[PDB]
């Protein structure tokens, strides 16, 4: 089954002027739980802004700040399981606090978040956009999947820098998230097409390249991302179309994983019933509703990783994990 991975449907116990967890961290955790903030980049930006709020309210430092904000990340692991972008952000923040030696260290810390967000989430996105501009030619059609803040940025800037392509947006239940791509494409004027994952093998005959987004690249080259990505890349290879995944460097986790079973958050199963024949699923004892959030595609199904350092073949992501550390 999925026993080790956690099932969740958390702010009732805490006091309204909360003292156990910081106010900003309570807002952040409840926005994670309800779904107001989605996407690995958006979650990392929101986390780092909330941590800047935590540090500017901190009054006394190196050990104290780390063991003070470890319960905050325990709360966030309870509210919505942390993706690896958040994990590396927290690792960098703890290394930054432990690096600060013997007031003025709060301003130097808070700017290091700004020097983290800029040259690893924003400048990295611009560099990945420049690299993926090369792989997008006139007339080809690009299959994207779900919503990615980087994939849609790549498509939009490739369109506004003169390309004339077409996008096919493949989407999955229950998040129905590629609509947030689709609408954002139509505002840019890009021609678009929308369909679900089961119809992917219908349009992979016409698709020229599959351009996906990664929530984490693991230490063997497996791409941990949204649950339809691995299946979509498998059908993409079976129709021999190249698969490109666009991931920043800071999402590279040194965790390694073979199958799509080890670290895969489960959203609440109550999302699954569609308009109903499944509303009373709790009373069926044998029936269990399962929706994964993430799966891993193997590096042999991915032809290219686009990174702010360059374009790498998805078997040399441990190379980048070495040279940045």
């Amino acid at each position: 089954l999925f026993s080790h991975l956690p099932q969740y449907s958390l702010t009732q116990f805490m006091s309204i002027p909360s003292s156990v967890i910081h106010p900003a961290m309570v807002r952040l955790g409840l926005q994670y739980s309800q779904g107001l903030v989605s996407g690995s980049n958006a979650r990392c930006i929101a986390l780092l802004r909330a941590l800047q709020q935590v540090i500017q309210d901190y009054t006394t430092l190196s050990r104290d700040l780390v063991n003070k904000l470890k319960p905050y990340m325990s709360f966030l692991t309870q509210c919505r399981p942390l993706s690896a972008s958040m994990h590396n952000a927290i690792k960098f923040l703890n290394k930054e606090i432990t690096s600060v030696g013997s007031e003025e260290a709060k301003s130097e810390l808070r700017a290091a978040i700004d020097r983290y967000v800029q040259e690893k989430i924003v400048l990295a996105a611009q560099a990945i956009s420049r690299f993926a501009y090369q792989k997008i030619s006139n007339g080809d059609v690009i299959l994207v999947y779900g919503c990615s803040s980087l994939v849609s940025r790549i498509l939009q800037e490739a369109w506004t820098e003169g390309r004339r392509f077409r996008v096919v947006v493949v989407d999955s239940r229950p998040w129905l998230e590629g609509r947030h791509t689709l609408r954002s494409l139509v505002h840019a004027g890009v021609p678009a097409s929308y369909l679900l994952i089961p119809a992917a093998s219908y349009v992979l005959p016409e698709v020229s390249k599959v351009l996906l987004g990664a929530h984490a690249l693991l230490a063997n080259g497996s791409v941990m991302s949204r649950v339809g990505t691995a299946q979509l890349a498998l059908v993409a290879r079976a129709h021999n179309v190249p698969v490109l995944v666009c991931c920043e460097t800071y999402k590279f986790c040194e965790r390694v994983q073979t199958d799509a079973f080890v670290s895969n958050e489960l959203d609440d199963p109550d999302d699954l019933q569609c308009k109903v024949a499944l509303a009373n699923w709790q009373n069926h004892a044998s029936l269990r509703l399962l929706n994964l959030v993430y799966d891993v595609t193997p590096p042999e199904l991915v032809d290219l990783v686009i990174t702010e350092l360059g374009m790498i073949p998805c078997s040399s992501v441990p190379v980048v994990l070495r040279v940045k550390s």
Binding site: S172, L196, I197, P198, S201, L234, C274, H284, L290
Partner: protein, 315 residues
């Protein structure tokens, strides 16, 4: 006449909506209509009888070309006419065909019990099965193996018509440890799955298969992990059509199933498609559990020659 209005009632309910829910009821109504055509039209010999049945099946096939269970049972009656006129080579032929048609009908209505009987040979205790859509034959296949063994079925509900919901409730009512998932997770949980048991809309003449959408993705995931893809499908779902690029293969329902009409202005710029059928090539199929056995895909062509005459392939 009552027959004629029943013919265009069947044709209109075939074009427009449903009528017969399952394919077994569709084939039984097709034999009822064909038997009525035999009995009530006047024909002298089997020549113009074959022409009449051929043109009626032509209009019933052009009514809904993706409903091949109607088009197969037109060809089975044509083969029955050719083989009951051959053994008399009249007067009593009009009786003989009817008798054979009755022997075809009782060949039906027991197709599901002869597929379900082979459940225990292919399903073992503490295994795990994956199914894509609601199939009456696969469900009864999983029911017969449930009363002796203990397994765990993963029903990947085939969006947009979430019809694996109505199967994972039918399986849960019989105590199978079922699990319905989004079907974006076909490849993810494929690594732990022992067998895949699916149903068809149509078995094409090369062992290829036309199933509900997402099956070819399911088949590719099964072939990746080398999971055997068992196919439970009787012999009315067996059509003598190779996968031509000439005739239309897919069926495309309204995009409201995929992208709802309440999206607004972006629907004038976005092309939404929603196919309902997916082509599975025979190299991803492992077995065809028919009502006559469990033979391989590379035997399916021979089943064509015993069922449909070569002249009746194209109507």
């Amino acid at each position: 006449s009552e027959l004629s209005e029943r013919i265009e009632s069947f044709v209109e309910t075939l074009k427009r909506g449903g009528g017969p829910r399952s394919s077994e009821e569709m084939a039984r109504e097709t034999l009822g209509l064909l038997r009525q055509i035999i009995t009530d039209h006047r024909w002298s010999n089997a020549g113009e009888l074959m022409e009449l049945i051929r043109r009626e099946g032509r209009r019933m096939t052009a009514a809904q070309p993706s409903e091949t269970t109607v088009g197969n049972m037109v060809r089975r009656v044509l083969k029955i006419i050719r083989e009951e006129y051959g053994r008399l080579h009249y007067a009593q032929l009009q009786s003989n065909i009817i008798e054979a048609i009755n022997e075809l009908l009782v060949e039906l209505e027991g197709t599901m019990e002869n597929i379900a009987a082979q459940a225990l040979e292919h399903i073992h205790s503490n295994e795990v099965i994956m199914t894509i859509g609601f199939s009456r034959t696969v469900e009864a296949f999983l029911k017969e193996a449930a009363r002796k063994r203990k397994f765990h079925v993963i029903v990947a509900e085939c969006a947009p018509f979430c019809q694996g919901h109505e199967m994972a409730v039918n399986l849960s009512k019989a105590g199978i440890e079922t699990t319905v998932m989004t079907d974006a997770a076909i490849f993810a949980v494929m690594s732990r799955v022992n067998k895949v048991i699916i149903g068809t809309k149509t078995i094409l003449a090369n062992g290829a298969l036309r199933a509900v959408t997402g099956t070819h993705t399911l088949a590719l995931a099964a072939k990746h992990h080398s999971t055997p893809l068992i196919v439970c499908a009787p012999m009315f779902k067996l059509s003598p059509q190779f996968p031509n690029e000439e005739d239309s293969f897919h069926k495309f329902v309204a995009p409201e199933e995929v992208l709802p009409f309440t999206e607004g202005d972006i629907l004038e710029k976005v092309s939404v498609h929603c196919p309902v059928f997916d082509y599975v090539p025979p190299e991803l199929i492992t077995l065809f559990i028919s009502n006559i056995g469990g033979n391989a895909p590379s035997y399916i062509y021979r089943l064509m020659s015993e069922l449909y005459h070569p002249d009746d392939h194209v109507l």
